[PDB]
Symmetry: D2
């Protein structure tokens, strides 16, 4: 838990940036459904866009715990801006962890330093959500190339990513041993963009359909050996869950902060409503659940940094509890503001809308409860 | 519970209208923040706009239970269209219940038959939400007129109502015995409209600030005697809560219906997800909570029709439970649809947004729990 | 819902008996683990021991709704005394509903009038709880007799019943079409009693292991045709669930009544704690959940009386919600009494102990949620 | 968090003792309502009876975190044995923290080393539970002595303690500045024992009424200055809450352990029930809540060791969440064992009974939520 002085200075800069730059922009980002371009460009200049890019490739190579602390601070003021960092890191992790030395040099170097290029991870399909093994995208080797046919949906930053990691069957009969992962570059012929689908929340973020129409990628773009794609995806999922837990902790904290401030300022029955025993009770339950969620998430993030095998269990616990907490706390934070909490100008209704996604993405809370229960019952 | 054949035919017409006319319009009503003019005009032609207007004034004079059944059917497909009927009835109840024979003839006759004119109830102020006795609008008698100064906020249909019931202090020192209620007509000099504030949900509905700047209303427009306004407001609140409970039952049912249909159609892991034990469990809890809420609401509505004093207790129980149920069921209905549930085109995210208001309006669930607990502990 | 004057007078007598006779005995019944012999003998004299015994066999033949109302009143003051009536009725239902005219005359006549004889239902085995089809008791026809070998556990009143309905495989390979039901009389050679197992609550009740060691019952004792036993068991289960729901409503109400009384009498901080906003909130939630549970249970009981097929769905909803409500309300009723609520002399701790069983017996709340969800998803 | 090698060896010994010595005795301790004399005598020989007694007085002087880790291990197998350590430490803390050097030497030396003498804290009265300022015990100085008149209830180990800390008004008009704390020795004339009241759980523990009838204690026995008693009590409460949180974490873990083991062994529907998605879900929620509770408690215990002022806030959060978690997890652990979970021989029903007390003692969860909410809203 002893943060290095590099971790402490980074997070002091992140808190200052979240407060002064990200927060004043959050309402317009949601209202107008804007990509957070200003934040992306600033994060690139500050070294915050690619936190987990290794130093070998010009990156800052902070730990998982540092990123989790950063996501909590950004989630407090703008869930969409936190999602940018989550998507960017998740799009890069399959290459960092399974790519050959040649593949990592060829595709990670372009993200060095202050690069503003974007990544994406393309696994989910209309036929394959929780049942990832039902994905229908196919990769057929033909000489020195793979031919990719299929489609993907719900791909964060899909249509704007310079590098997409695409999961596809190379042997459709081997199931979990028949999937592969491929680097796909923006501009590849046969890569076609669909709708940017309109969402309840996280509106400051791009949500892409992708289509592959005889898309030829060079045979060197496979990440690892044929048939290893599913394990590669599963290894990144443990990390993605912690990032979604940390974002949900931030959302919950940000909504609590606004509710706490309102109880101190809002006067009914002759004194601030913070003097009312039931308001005090709601705030107590909210904060207790936020802090519990924060402790779980920070523990899981440290286990990941330590390469500990128990990170899967505690990451799944943190993801479930943090996101359920964000949903419950934001729902009650709107309640604490009364009618004003239902008004768009006051922010908490957006945080409630943002919070619902964290119970679904990186695996629904039903899927994660199964990951947690199976790890406990079949250790 | 034995519905008359007039009740049964009315509700068969309402279900047909909800399905064929109201539901296909709900997404655009929310997306574009439209007043439900088509529904208003149709309800007027069918005799559904003013259900509680007495037959003496050209009205249909259905019971509270019939309206509650109608609100459940409309809430199932469009919460905003249900809110139109709630606002219209609530704006009329103070006159129906406290108005002199002369006042009722003078202001209720214009709502007879197929009239499309609108009402509103103006009690809430920025300084007075749950603490209604802190309202600052003042009514000063001057000869044959009252002079009204002050303001109101969150007034449903406030800026489009032909008749507004305005609550104001005539003796600011007598507290709950110093408030009066006044009929205020559209076009009165000194009646000024503010913002239509933008909301998280119930977007197909007008939400008005009102200002009174030396507004002169004739002395005949007072509803009852001076100082009786607070009791008049309290008597309408018991009825408003039942209407909000019934709307929340409808919202919850409509979201459950969509989730139920999705589990039957959505195939993951080789069979429809309805075959999955945890999906079955969520649907069981959702439906159980909806039916419990429906039974409470129908009981409270019958007690109101019977003039039973225990309607306050059971109306407050139904309001609390129905609206908490709508919040929980819509939150889980989005969960049951996975990623697709987070997409605006699929409706349930709007129902989740609509559901949050029912925990706040007609009195927050904190205020209602106090009404319930006080009635039980101090009978 | 319109109770007959016979229903109203019966329930006025039951309330008087519950208050004056059953309640003062409840603490000793639990403390000393006594069979409620006094209540059994009194119920027999008043015609309350065998409510569902048909008039054709000397019985009172009240409906399911009347018994459900009786169980609520008894559950309010002594869950163990309510369980006597539940066990007695459940032991009789398989014969009433599936027995031939000859079998019903031969075994139901002994329960006519003021008979104090007892019944029991023996289905559950150590290997077969929720998975009833795994039961291992076997019935082999040999000439004019069936030979019964096997065992049963958790049999309420098992060791004291004059007539036990025993479920057993006659064709172990046909699963749900290979079970039969048999009348077994006290005193049959080869019927052996095991432990009366010691329980957390419902201590005023006998909980028997049964063993069948080449037990010969005459071939006329089969209830219906061979292979119909499972359907017979399933038909009684719908009724048993409603009875357990009604008992749980009573438990919850009885605990609420004590907590309500305590808030009125217990003075802290200068006034009764009923003046405290959070105590008011707990009591509101408790009572709302009790009334919802009561409405569900009464609806399911009426559907059963009407022979409506939807009784399975609403009986499973009432059972789940009523028993979860009894658990939550009794847990909070102990909380409302503070330290005194943890003391055995004050009753609510026993009601909390009693309440936990209702979430388990007549099918666990996990099994019932599946009955509810399957009925909704596969109608 | 880095445990010293003395902490690690102590907790390895505690786990071994809990498993081999404490756990096999837990069922009889509850069944027969026995004081844990064997455990007390063994803890004394191992240096575990007085963990927080300073080294200056012959004690081991482990931290709060070490004791909290010990209480978790003992709470896992016997809540009553954990309560012995909690009561013993709490009875000593007022002297350790507020006593003059002379008073600490005079009364703490007798607890050095392997002493088996017992302490108690006597604050609560029938008229003063949460409202401690309503206590009526009075201390009147008369020459070189104080005369103590009054009574106390719910005093753990009250009737067997060699040293009792008694809180009493010395100036009944100064409220929170008019209470004092006094050392009271077993054998003082005028100290009279009442009932050992019979409880729902924690039955292996003594629960005493105390009466003071012109009880003369020497004037040197006052702990601190007159009027400082309330602050002394409040300072110990922060520590007591953490100890009750840690005990509740242990209870919850112990019940989860039994449920986890049962799902692995209990076969229904052809395979262990651990293969069932809903059982997996319950175990996931249970374990997540246990680990969250454990993290909160360990954080609060470290803040106390660091003398950090934020320990009050996090201790109140841990106490609320840990005890609510013990109640919910034990309630579900009984559920996971089915009928067998309701049987006394299987332990979890006792853990459920034990768990309910942790929501009440050291301050009810209503009082603690107020401590948490006030600290957040009025920092
Ligand atoms: C806005 C958004 C961004 C996302 N970003 C990415 C991205 O960048 N790249 C990417 O590849 N994916 C992304 N995801 C995919 C996301 O993680 C999925 O939606 C999720 O994995 C579930 O898929 P589904 O929506 O089809 O739900 P379904 O699998 O259809 O689930 C429907 C319901 O059934 C339940 N269910 C399903 N299976 C089971 C089971 N076996 N047991 C019990 N319950 C079950 C689920 O919990 C859910 O409640 C994103 C999704 C969204 C909506
Ligand atoms: C969209 C909308 C439509 C509405 N329509 C109408 C309308 O047509 N006409 C009209 O006159 N009004 C209308 N209402 C008013 C509405 O009912 C109020 O918002 C509600 O009565 C609460 O007022 P408030 O928002 O100021 O909340 P506040 O009173 O500020 O409450 C803030 C928070 O404190 C809690 N709280 C407040 N007092 C207490 C207490 N004593 N004990 C415990 N907790 C407490 C509340 O539960 C809430 O969580 C509408 C409101 C909205 C938002
Ligand atoms: C005091 C008492 C009185 C009773 N009286 C009678 C009586 O008079 N006569 C009689 O025949 N029986 C009686 N019952 C039997 C009772 O109904 C059962 O205990 C119940 O049916 C469950 O059986 P089990 O205890 O073996 O639990 P199990 O079936 O072992 O269940 C263990 C856990 O797994 C869960 N589970 C099991 N299967 C599934 C599944 N498919 N999906 C999800 N979760 C699952 C359960 O919910 C439970 O949480 C009584 C039981 C008790 C304890
Ligand atoms: C078995 C046992 C052991 C204990 N051991 C010790 C001991 O060793 N020494 C000692 O001095 N004490 C001890 N305690 C005392 C214990 O902490 C109290 O019972 C507790 O402090 C509450 O007091 P009460 O039971 O009178 O509850 P009450 O104060 O009567 O509370 C009744 C209910 O009202 C609620 N309530 C009370 N005040 C408020 C408020 N202001 N706002 C909202 N809700 C409120 C409470 O939460 C509770 O639900 C013990 C108690 C027990 C039962």
């Amino acid at each position: 838990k002893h943060l290095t002085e590099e971790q402490k200075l980074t997070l002091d800069m992140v808190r200052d940036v979240a407060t002064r730059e990200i927060a004043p922009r959050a309402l317009e980002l949601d209202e107008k459904s804007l990509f957070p371009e200003y934040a992306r460009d600033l994060f690139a200049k500050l070294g915050l866009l690619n936190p987990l890019l290794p130093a070998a490739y010009g990156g800052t190579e902070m730990g998982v715990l540092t990123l989790a602390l950063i996501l909590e601070e950004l989630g407090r003021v703008c869930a969409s801006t936190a999602l940018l960092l989550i998507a960017q890191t998740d799009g890069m992790l399959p290459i960092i962890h399974g790519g050959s030395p040649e593949l990592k040099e060829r595709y990670l170097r372009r993200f060095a330093g202050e690069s503003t290029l974007l990544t994406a991870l393309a696994a989910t399909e209309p036929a394959a959500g929780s049942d990832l093994l039902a994905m229908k995208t196919r990769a057929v080797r033909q000489g020195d190339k793979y031919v990719i046919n299929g489609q993907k949906c719900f791909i964060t930053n899909g249509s704007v990513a310079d590098v997409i990691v695409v999961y596809a069957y190379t042997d459709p009969e081997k199931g979990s041993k028949g999937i592969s992962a491929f680097v796909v570059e923006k501009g590849t012929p046969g890569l076609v963009y669909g709708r940017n689908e309109s969402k309840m929340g996280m509106r400051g973020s791009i949500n892409s359909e992708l289509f592959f129409e005889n898309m030829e990628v060079p045979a060197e773009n496979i990440i690892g050996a044929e048939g290893t794609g599913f394990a590669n995806l599963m290894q990144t999922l443990s990390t993605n869950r912690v990032f979604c837990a940390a974002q949900a902790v931030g959302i919950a904290q940000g909504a609590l902060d606004i509710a706490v401030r309102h109880t101190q300022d809002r006067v009914q029955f002759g004194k601030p409503i913070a003097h009312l025993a039931p308001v005090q009770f709601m705030v107590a339950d909210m904060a207790t659940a936020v802090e519990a969620s924060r402790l779980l998430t920070r523990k899981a993030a440290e286990l990941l940094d330590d390469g500990d095998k128990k990170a899967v269990l505690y990451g799944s616990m943190a993801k479930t509890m943090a996101s359920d907490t964000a949903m419950r706390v934001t729902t009650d934070a709107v309640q604490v503001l009364g009618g004003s909490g239902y008004m768009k100008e006051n922010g908490v209704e957006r945080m409630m809308r943002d919070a619902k996604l964290t119970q679904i993405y990186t695996g629904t809370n039903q899927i994660t409860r199964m990951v947690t229960g199976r790890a406990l019952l079949f250790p």
